[PDB]
Write a protein that binds this ligand. Structure first.
Ligand SMILES: COC(=O)[C@H](Cc1cnc[nH]1)NC(=O)CN(CCCc1ccccc1)CC(=O)O
Ligand SMILES: [Zn+2]
Length: 955
């Protein structure tokens, strides 16, 4: 009978009957709520802690302190004081880890090889026991946070996110600045005599209290074993009985309602944000009146708000529903993007909104809708895919805070109560008398008179004219607006087909004709009534030239726009498709309950092959596409770096500027012509994978072919015109640099590529092992020590059959300098591989092996792996055992000599390309001295003047 350390252990966690995992919920004596998960099949174990404090509890005079504290627990505790003990332990044991801070939560998660849960968890527990907050770490780390913020400065979501806070009640914690930067966490604290290390110590001690913590742990250990484990490591987290913060008063009071904000964006975008304050609905989780109204106002089917708004050519996409706030307040929003016509009809757009809200009011609550929503969720739950442990633990850790233990798994899914009163009550708040309207549009350049402090956002504020409100308050009924009708796409066949006699472990090539290559595998693994049906359509006309590339794109976009109304049912019913053009021709994937899949597929291909373009729709989509082309000049420096490198190293690739130019010559006549052309010769390669039989799959494939032949007279592509593109072949010992300026962002970016060779069993493992070995040392050096920026990445680069090592960094320092430090770092690595024990070397092999061998948890994960073998024409489905068997063979001498051949600064076959992206305005290890780079003036000339690699041979 009773353990002193456990307050209780009832009862029985409700899981899906499909869910093979075992679960124990429990509460420690110190008040920590805890879920244990035993899965004796798992390859990685995982754990997570969530503390119910976050940025909303920041001291007013030190903004971002809790985000900063989160950064700091990683950098040393009393029991494991090495600045990077934690993260290195993880790396050498196939783990990874992150954290985040919302306004009420700080959330910490890791995964490790199943065999080392305990070692991981023990280091992990110390974050919550005796963090060091080293003076020297704090000094460095504040920069990583300053970077985390700069990254966000010029991004439109983050600016709008803060603007909202800065326009509500300034006295309210909602208005606080979450991220924090260097100014708020080092400069102004010094100016005001604060010792931040103390302030972190004070804050950790004040709020990281056990009564405010929830833990989840997933491992192969029995439930009893996990219990002992958790109790051991966590019983000594101290209970300081902290009252859990509430915010009963809304940040939007009367003076904050009936306001119009006109806002200048960074990207050339136009949207309208409509938003009403609502009470906190969390406690209504079993009826969920917010979701009901969301499902409705947000509907995109026939008769919906969105589809009238879009027929009138005013908006294109809509999102509506309940938005989080914190304990005590929430929002209900309706946000749309805007056409040019739309921008001019904002007053009208909102009337339409209120006419629809009025309709809902007119019909009253609807139990049949509730019933649909509830059934949909029952089914979602019953067959939810197995989640990756890290996500799972992190997520549940969050919600242990809201639901009884027994309910944690089901609470966010199952609906129980039908609540016409709550439905009605929330609806009563969606009124013009407490509306907020915000317009984001470049047309406010200069017309602005305010500036948001933290992001610099410029905008104007205004009371909506008393007599615009009145006009909205009288919103009539409007007969273009109907409730949605029954969802016909809801599945009702869930039968798992039995496993065939000749069924196989990997996909089989079951059809090899000139028209198509069908790869097929019945699911032997997850047994859910779902499937994935993937297709590459090859046509050389998709990417023959910039003009065509645009056409391929627009066609597909107008097609998706056209099916949208009908497709949406299917999406709600757990059946979705994804359709986009590639450099190779087109891609189509259909995932979800297999029951009604063949209906949706058929509808897609048919529409595709008999497509009839609305002209108004074309003109709007095109104008939007133009903007998204420009809008690249506002993506981030490192994305630019990455993007130029892709352009520089692929045989064929059209630039954003080329596409922009060629976009003007795209006319209705021209597109109409293009489509039948595209569809007239194709090849199809497909993976059909899931709850389906060989006969079913063969049929599905042929139905696709048949529909095309029938409506597009499609016929086969010639084997020889199955063009796959090559990577540029860099000379032995060369170094080229390409330079560009980012105009928006005041940071710089850099990608450095050391190209090694073709992919091959041996060549792959040489690069992979080296990547694993440097993986954390790189992060720990270039970011944690050197603090070059927030974004510091290294790893293998694999494109068009060739490979290499890359570094990507976004910094404040110039690329000339970034370059220098990577090279410095690179020598440190030859050194430390020389110095490391055979056993340290073997651990790395074992860590790679484990990452490589980790088994898929869900159908779409397994599909992805195969689809990679297929899209890359390597067709090596057994690559993981092969490549791993070979890895174990490798010795230290092999890696030293691999590095010396291909990577060292004076490597006989070093092949280096750097992309330098300059910012809007432009004691340490020893950097080696570098050659004069060759500066690339012209991308085409560069490509013309080098060899191209071969392409890989298949299995
Ligand atoms: C259940 O209700 C729905 O289906 C709607 C409506 C909709 C989706 N697509 C067409 N309409 N879908 C929603 O996602 C509504 N809403 C999203 C607001 C969160 C948010 C967060 C950050 C920045 C902006 C906004 C809640 C949700 O996730 O379900
Ligand atoms: Zn952070």
């Amino acid at each position: 009978m009773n353990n002193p350390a456990i307050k209780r252990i009832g009862n029985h966690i409700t899981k899906s009957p499909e869910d093979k995992r075992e679960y124990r919920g429990l509460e420690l004596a110190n008040g920590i709520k805890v879920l244990l998960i035993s899965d004796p099949t798992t390859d990685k174990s995982s754990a997570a802690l969530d503390v119910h404090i976050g940025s909303l509890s920041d001291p007013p005079n030190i903004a971002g302190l809790s985000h900063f504290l989160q950064h700091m627990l990683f950098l040393g505790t009393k029991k494991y004081p090495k600045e990077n003990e934690y993260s290195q332990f993880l790396s050498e044991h196939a783990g990874s880890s992150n954290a985040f801070t919302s306004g009420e939560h700080t959330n910490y998660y890791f995964d490790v090889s199943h065999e080392h849960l305990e070692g991981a968890l023990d280091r992990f527990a110390q974050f919550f026991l005796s963090p060091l907050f080293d003076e020297s770490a704090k000094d460095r780390e504040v920069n990583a946070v300053d970077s985390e913020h700069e990254k966000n400065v010029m991004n439109d979501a983050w600016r709008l996110f803060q603007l909202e806070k800065a326009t509500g009640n300034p006295k309210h914690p909602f208005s606080k600045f979450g991220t924090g930067n260097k100014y708020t966490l080092e400069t102004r604290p010094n100016q005001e005599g604060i010792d931040v290390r103390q302030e972190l110590l004070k804050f950790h001690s004040a709020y990281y209290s056990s009564n405010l913590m929830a833990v989840v742990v997933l491992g192969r250990e029995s439930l009893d074993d996990l219990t002992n484990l958790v109790v051991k490591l966590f019983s000594e987290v101290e209970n300081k009985n902290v009252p859990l913060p509430e915010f009963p008063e809304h940040p939007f009071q009367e003076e904050h309602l009936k306001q119009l904000y006109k806002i200048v964006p960074i990207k050339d975008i136009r949207n309208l944000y409509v938003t009403f304050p609502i009470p906190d609905l969390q406690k209504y989780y079993k009826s969920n009146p917010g979701h009901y109204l969301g499902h409705l106002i947000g509907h995109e089917g026939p008769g919906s708000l969105l589809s009238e708004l879009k027929s009138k050519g005013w908006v294109n996409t809509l999102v509506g529903g309940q938005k989080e706030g914190a304990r005590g307040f929430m929002f209900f929003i309706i946000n749309v993007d805007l056409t040019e016509e739309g921008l001019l009809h904002v007053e009208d757009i909102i009337l339409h909104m209120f006419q629809y809200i009025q309709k809902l009011r007119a019909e009253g609550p609807q139990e049949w809708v509730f019933q649909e929503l509830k059934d949909l969720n029952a089914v979602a739950f019953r067959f939810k895919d197995k989640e990756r442990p890290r996500g799972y633990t992190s997520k549940i850790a969050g919600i242990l805070h809201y639901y009884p233990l027994e309910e944690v798994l089901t609470a966010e899914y199952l609906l129980e109560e039908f609540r016409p009163d709550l439905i009605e009550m929330v609806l009563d708040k969606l009124r013009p008398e407490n509306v907020r309207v915000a317009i984001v549009s470049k047309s406010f350049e200069g017309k602005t008179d305010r500036t948001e402090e933290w992001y610099g956002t410029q905008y104007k504020q205004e009371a909506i004219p008393d007599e615009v409100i009145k006009k909205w308050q009288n919103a009539d009924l409007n007969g273009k607006f109907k409730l949605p009708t029954k969802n016909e796409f809801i599945p009702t066949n869930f039968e798992i087909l039995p496993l065939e006699k000749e069924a196989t472990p990997y996909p089989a090539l079951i059809k090899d004709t000139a028209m198509s290559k069908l790869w097929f595998k019945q699911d032997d693994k997850f047994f859910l009534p779902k499937a994935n049906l993937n297709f590459e359509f090859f046509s050389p006309f998709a990417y023959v030239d910039p003009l065509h590339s645009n056409m391929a794109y627009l066609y597909l976009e107008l097609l998706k726009d056209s099916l949208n109304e009908y497709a949406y049912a299917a999406e709600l019913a757990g059946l979705s498709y994804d359709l986009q053009n590639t450099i190779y021709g087109m891609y189509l994937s259909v995932k979800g309950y297999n029951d009604k899949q063949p209906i949706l597929l058929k509808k897609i291909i048919e529409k595709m092959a008999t497509f009839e373009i609305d002209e108004k729709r074309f003109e709007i989509i095109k104008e939007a596409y133009m903007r998204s082309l420009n809008n690249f000049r506002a993506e981030q420096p490192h994305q630019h770096a990455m993007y130029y490198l892709r352009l520089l190293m692929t045989e064929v690739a059209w630039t954003k500027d080329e596409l922009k130019e060629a976009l003007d010559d795209v006319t209705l006549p021209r597109l109409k012509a293009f489509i039948p052309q595209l569809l007239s010769r194709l090849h199809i390669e497909a993976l059909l994978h899931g709850n389906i039989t060989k006969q079913a799959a063969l049929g599905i494939m042929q139905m696709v072919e048949d529909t095309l032949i029938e409506h597009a007279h499609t016929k086969p592509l010639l084997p020889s015109q199955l063009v796959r593109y090559r990577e540029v072949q860099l000379p032995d010992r060369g170094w080229f640099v390409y330079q560009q300026r980012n105009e928006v962002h005041n940071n710089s970016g850099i990608e450095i590529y050391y190209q090694t060779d073709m992919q091959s069993t041996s060549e792959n493992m040489f690069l992979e092992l080296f990547a694993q070995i440097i993986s954390e040392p790189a992060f720990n050096t270039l970011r944690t020590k050197e603090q070059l920026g927030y974004i510091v990445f290294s790893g293998p680069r694999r494109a068009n059959g060739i490979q290499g090592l890359r570094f990507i960094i976004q910094s404040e320092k110039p690329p000339h300098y970034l370059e220098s430090r990577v090279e410095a770092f690179l020598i440190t690595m030859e050194k430390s591989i020389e110095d490391m024990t055979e056993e340290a070397f073997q651990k790395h092999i074992q860590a790679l092996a484990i990452r490589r061998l980790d088994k898929p948890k869900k159908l779409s994960a397994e599909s992805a792996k195969y689809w990679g073998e297929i899209i890359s024409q390597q067709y090596n489905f057994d690559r993981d055992n092969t490549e791993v068997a070979y890895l174990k063979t490798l010795t230290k001498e092999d890696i030293i000599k691999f590095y010396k051949e291909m990577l060292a600064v004076d490597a006989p076959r070093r092949h280096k390309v750097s992309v330098h992206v300059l910012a809007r305005e432009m004691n340490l290890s020893q950097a080696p001295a570098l050659p004069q780079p060759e500066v690339i003036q012209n991308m085409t000339e560069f490509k013309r003047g080098l060899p191209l690699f071969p392409l890989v041979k298949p299995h």
